[PDB]
Symmetry: C2
Amino acid sequence: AEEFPVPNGFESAYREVDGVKLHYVKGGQGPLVMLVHGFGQTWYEWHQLMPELAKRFTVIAPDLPGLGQSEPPKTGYSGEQVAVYLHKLARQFSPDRPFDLVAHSIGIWNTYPMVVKNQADIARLVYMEAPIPDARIYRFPAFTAQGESLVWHFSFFAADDRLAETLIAGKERFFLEHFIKSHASNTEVFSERLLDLYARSYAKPHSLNASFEYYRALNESVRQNAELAKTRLQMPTMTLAGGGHGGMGTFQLEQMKAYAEDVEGHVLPGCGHWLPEECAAPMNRLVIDFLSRGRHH
Amino acid sequence: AEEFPVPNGFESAYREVDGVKLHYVKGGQGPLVMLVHGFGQTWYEWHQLMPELAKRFTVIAPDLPGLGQSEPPKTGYSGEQVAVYLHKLARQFSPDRPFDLVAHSIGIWNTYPMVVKNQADIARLVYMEAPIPDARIYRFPAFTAQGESLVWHFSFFAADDRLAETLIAGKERFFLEHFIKSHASNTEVFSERLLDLYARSYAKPHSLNASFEYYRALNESVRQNAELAKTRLQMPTMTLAGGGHGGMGTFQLEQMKAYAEDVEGHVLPGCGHWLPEECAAPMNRLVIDFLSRGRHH
């Protein structure tokens, strides 16, 4: 039984990668674009972009290990470990061509190491709405003059004693609604039905734990990236960020400038963190146009 | 009924102040010293210091409004509002003479306004283990290279939709053990028996809610103190801070220097946030010695 409805012309399928059964949704023809979701979500956050992209590209949207319908990783949750699974999954479908990569939220954390270590495999890169794990994340404030801050959940989720799972179990829908809307400008896009679907998915006990294990590995990912960042990214890159309440604003592009030689950025006014849902039409257009400057169907 | 055992020779009593029934524990003879507890605790955190102080002073340890056995405040939870209750309580027992003040954690927030507005009523002051509410609190990090940060709970507790009460209700004993131990160096002093006592108190639904209303008023307290701090404190002051895991370190004294003309500070090695319990012998000695420089019984 699918956790989320599959768009017409797409298939929901599974591939074993290093002994981990990964779920993905795939459609289209042409060069490969892999879309990687982030926290609180699944492949389904891309369901509006996928049919438009599928007119020119083969599109694959995996569930991150442990989330959606993907099995947990058997190595670990650090960015370098998870990126192996995503890199090998992409290469099963694009072994002879470089592929495009689009990532949101912790999808960035889980793809950056394989981008930097396999640059010849990455044709074009789109990153939206999350820091690459590095020391900049230690500058975000715990509290603001307007109330709760943007990433205090970094501490909540990384805490031991299974603090987050223990407090959120039995309240998964409640917490996810608060978390989404606290990081949104446009909350009306999150219907009760949509919130129900996302809540049911990450409330699976192994998915609730998987969600926070990404954050419990965050400092390890920072330490990994300190070495990897000695090599700058050379492929064409675009960053997107929300300019409204909940968004990263100018931080996204300014951080990427330290990582990539060839980068352009957009801040979307009136949009928060959840760009594919809050601001689907402009986000879709910017991604499609940026990727279509390359060779496509 | 008594939530915590009263030391021999002390009395547990109540005093109505501006329509709010405040619980306190009182003993000894001589000039008055008021000891004000902080978050996660009650008057009982002072129970090892109180018999020693009571040999030289009249000692009163109130429960903060809404916490322990004290009724919630009727005005509000900002520092200036709550300080009225504590000032009037102290002056009921010391109407013609200045009194001493010792405060820990949010006890600082709830006493600073009455200290600065009634300086002639405060003979000597001891503050430990919390920032005075001001703009400095906006500079603490949400996340650190070691894991959860010191004050990410500011955002958690201040969050709207009763986020904190909704997640923590029914799990108060689990949450308080995690919160206390994660802020401690000498965690071994928090036996299951002691944690049971503290958790049963703040699990009262009005006490769980009161606990977080102090943080929901924090930005208001910051705004209040921006005006009040135009006058420095003139009385002898001492700050204490833990030097170990969970402690404020050098911040406590460095902030206090902006507030007080006459301040000495100590950082206690191997001690975290919970000085009366983690480091009873050195903390009690420092407090008794400092207060005994003034006239006593």
